Structure 1
Amino acid sequence: TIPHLAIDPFSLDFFDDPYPDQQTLRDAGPVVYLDKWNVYGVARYAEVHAVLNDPTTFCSSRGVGLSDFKKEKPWRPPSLILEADPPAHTRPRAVLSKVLSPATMKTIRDGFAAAADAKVDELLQRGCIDAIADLAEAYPLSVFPDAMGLKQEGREHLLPYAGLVFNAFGPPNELRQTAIERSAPHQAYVNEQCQRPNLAPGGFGACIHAFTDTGEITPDEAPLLVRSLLSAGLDTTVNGIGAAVYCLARFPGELQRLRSDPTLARNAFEEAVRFESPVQTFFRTTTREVELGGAVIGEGEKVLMFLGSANRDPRRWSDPDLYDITRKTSGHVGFGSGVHMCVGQLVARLEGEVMLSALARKVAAIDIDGPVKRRFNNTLRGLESLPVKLTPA
């Protein structure tokens, strides 16, 4: 009853252009079987949203990558939040929620916005820039390591470590095995910056450690929660901001609307998150036999959720392949959905909003003026290089 497909969603041809294969996955049925990796797949909005919102049946503690932690040993100690289920997940989640809270956003907003304006002013002096290295990477690098409380030395480890983490959710293909081969120095640096004495006062990392006396987490759980923010909080925003700039470069009519009302900045970034879905895929593991969209799935089976595909499902979205900065984006799954929904989404949205605000106020045109090169990752979608000329307003 379940269609079997040979599509490899972790192949370079897939990453290069996922959208035809994603339609094939959606239209084959609500539940498909991917023979290449022996996993179930769900690519429509309805099933993806259903799976995300039943964490009991579709658990995360057996891993949210291809690997099943009941069968193989995790490549690194499990995340206490991403790779945990309720109730063990609940109190670490609460702590990160309060650390990455509206009050914390109020403390950092003015500084995040100054750096966004400063960066755009600096790029406008160069004219022709790489919107990845010089913007999508440079701007988060200028705010997020400092907001964490990290020392200056060794920050060049951060993006390689995150790329490794996201590649490691994938199958044991060359992307994943090469990433792990090169992992030793990046893991060393990261695990070391997770210790309380190495995190500057007032930052996110020192705040997690300062939350270790409330009965929610113990001191030995704080380094791994810092590790969560160093894994999940930089590379995602790089690809989210890169997606937004790529969208404005490809849809000049939407840049013109954004310029005329810079208060659309926050929704323009949210739409970019839906439209490109920087985090493309995640797995769950079934804890029991379950019926999903007419399909019987046995216990202990991996289920691949196509988040990017669900965000382009025409069953849920009108004109899903159009970038529309006034779209009602509520309900997109680019940040997930349910008990694991991105606990850092306020940081991501703050960064994306203030950057698109700076572009809206200072830039008249964004024109691609060089070869676009895609960056390949088993989990993240984004560009390696995006050459653009910025015309000042």
Structure 2
Amino acid sequence: TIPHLAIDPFSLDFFDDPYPDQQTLRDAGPVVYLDKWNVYGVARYAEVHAVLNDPTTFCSSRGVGLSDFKKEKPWRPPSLILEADPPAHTRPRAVLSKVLSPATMKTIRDGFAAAADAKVDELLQRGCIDAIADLAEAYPLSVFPDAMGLKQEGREHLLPYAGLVANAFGPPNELRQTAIERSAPHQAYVNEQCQRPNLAPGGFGACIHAFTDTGEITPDEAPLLVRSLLSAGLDTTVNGIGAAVYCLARFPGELQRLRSDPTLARNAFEEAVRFESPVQTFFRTTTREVELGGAVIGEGEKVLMFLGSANRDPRRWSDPDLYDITRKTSGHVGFGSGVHMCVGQLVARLEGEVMLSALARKVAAIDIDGPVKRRFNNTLRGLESLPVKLTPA
């Protein structure tokens, strides 16, 4: 009753161009079995949304990667929030939602907006830049480690650790193997920065430790929650800003609408998160036998959610393959949906908005003028190099 496909969603061929296979995954049926990794897959919007909004049946405490924590030991101690179900998830989640609250965004908006405007002006002096290294990476690296309260020493480990975390969500293919092997220096730096004496007062990390006074988390939970911000709060914003720049470089008409109305900067970033979906996939594990799309999935089964495919499903989105900055983007699952929906979404939107705002007010054109290279990661979709020429406004 369930179609069996041999497509490998974690293959280099797939990462290179996933859209044809994603339609094959969608049109084969609302639920598919992937023989390559012995998992269930859902690729349409309706099933991804339902699975994401049924945490009692599709749990996250047995891992959000392929590995089943009930079966194998995790490569690192489980995340107290991402790899937790309610009610264990609730109080650590409330702490991160307060640390990264709308009220906190007021304290960092001027610094983030200034750094964004300064970087675009700096890049306009050089003309021909790499939108990844010199823009997508340089800007988050210039605001987020300081907002965490991180010291200067050892920041070179932040991006390699983030790519390791994202790779480790995938199957035991070469990409995961080479990430985990000899990863101990990346882990030691991160785990050391998660301790209270290494976080500047007033930063996200110190503010987390400050919530141990409240009884929401214990002092020994706070470092793990700091690790969560250091695993997810940098690499994804990089790919997201690079995607937006990629779109504005591929859709020059949408760049011109953004110039004529910079207040579209925030929704233009949101649409870039739908269009490229930097977090492509996540896993759930069935708590019980469950009917999904006419298929009976047993207990203890891994279910793979194609977030990116759900954001391009023509059953839900009109013209899904077009970048449209005025599109009503609410309901896209680029940040998740439900109880685990990205608790850091306000930081990513803020970083994205002020960058696209900076581009909207200072740049006339963005033309690709060099070899484009894709970056391969079992979870993330993003570019290795995006050579563009910026024309000043």
Q: TM-score, normalised by structure 2?
A: 1.00
CA offset digits 1:37-94 (Å, max 9, x no partner) = 0000000000000000000000000000000000000000000000000000000000
CA offset digits 1:170-202 (Å, max 9, x no partner) = 000000000001311110000000000000010
**Quick one: distance in 1 between partners of 2:100 and 2:147?**
11
The CA RMSD over aligned residues, in Å, is 0.3
CA offset digits 1:333-358 (Å, max 9, x no partner) = 00000000000000000000000000
Following TM superposition, by how much is the alpha carbon of 1:243 offset from its aligned partner in structure 2, in angstroms? 0.5
Where does residue 392 of structure 2 map in the other structure? 392
Q: Secondary structure at the match of 1:343?
A: coil
**Quick one: distance in 2 between partners of 1:323 and 1:260?**
17
CA offset digits 1:22-48 (Å, max 9, x no partner) = 000000000000000000000000000
CA offset digits 1:126-167 (Å, max 9, x no partner) = 000000000000000000000000001110100000000000
Q: Secondary structure at the match of 1:146?
A: helix
Mark the runs of 5 or more structure 2 residues left unpaired by the alignment: none
Q: Secondary structure at the match of 2:221?
A: helix
CA offset digits 1:332-385 (Å, max 9, x no partner) = 000000000000000000000000000000000000000000000000000000
**Quick one: distance in 2 between partners of 1:148 and 1:289?**
42
**Quick one: distance in 2 between partners of 1:215 and 1:88?**
14
**Quick one: distance in 2 between partners of 1:277 and 1:288?**
29
CA offset digits 1:239-297 (Å, max 9, x no partner) = 00000000000000000000000000000000000000000000000000000111110
**Quick one: distance in 2 between partners of 1:377 and 1:110?**
33
Where does residue 284 of structure 2 map in the other structure? 284
**Quick one: distance in 1 between partners of 2:103 and 2:306?**
33
**Quick one: distance in 1 between partners of 2:279 and 2:271?**
14
Following TM superposition, by how much is the alpha carbon of 1:214 offset from its aligned partner in structure 2, in angstroms? 1.0
Following TM superposition, by how much is the alpha carbon of 1:213 offset from its aligned partner in structure 2, in angstroms? 1.5
Where does residue 121 of structure 1 map in the other structure? 121
Q: Secondary structure at the match of 1:367?
A: strand
Counterpart mapping for 1:1-393 below 5 A: 1-393=1-393
Following TM superposition, by how much is the alpha carbon of 1:316 offset from its aligned partner in structure 2, in angstroms? 0.3
CA offset digits 1:94-135 (Å, max 9, x no partner) = 000000001110000010000000000000000000000000
**Quick one: distance in 2 between partners of 1:15 and 1:215?**
44
**Quick one: distance in 2 between partners of 1:96 and 1:324?**
32
**Quick one: distance in 2 between partners of 1:240 and 1:389?**
20
**Greater alpha carbon shift after TM alignment, 74-83 vs 182-191:** 182-191
**Greater alpha carbon shift after TM alignment, 37-46 vs 211-220:** 211-220
Identity %: 100
**Quick one: distance in 2 between partners of 1:124 and 1:318?**
36
Q: Secondary structure at the match of 2:170?
A: coil
**Quick one: distance in 1 between partners of 2:77 and 2:243?**
31
**Quick one: distance in 1 between partners of 2:213 and 2:24?**
51
**Quick one: distance in 2 between partners of 1:392 and 1:30?**
47
**Quick one: distance in 2 between partners of 1:168 and 1:11?**
14
**Quick one: distance in 1 between partners of 2:223 and 2:254?**
42
Q: TM-score, normalised by structure 1?
A: 1.00
Q: Secondary structure at the match of 1:129?
A: strand
**Quick one: distance in 2 between partners of 1:380 and 1:367?**
25
Following TM superposition, by how much is the alpha carbon of 1:215 offset from its aligned partner in structure 2, in angstroms? 1.4
Q: Secondary structure at the match of 1:212?
A: helix
Following TM superposition, by how much is the alpha carbon of 1:391 offset from its aligned partner in structure 2, in angstroms? 0.3
Mark the runs of 5 or more structure 1 residues left unpaired by the alignment: none
**Greater alpha carbon shift after TM alignment, 175-184 vs 327-336:** 175-184
**Quick one: distance in 2 between partners of 1:128 and 1:184?**
37
Q: Secondary structure at the match of 2:40?
A: strand
Following TM superposition, by how much is the alpha carbon of 1:234 offset from its aligned partner in structure 2, in angstroms? 0.1
User: How many residue pairs are counted as aligned between the two chains?
Assistant: 393
**Quick one: distance in 2 between partners of 1:372 and 1:260?**
28
**Quick one: distance in 1 between partners of 2:348 and 2:55?**
24
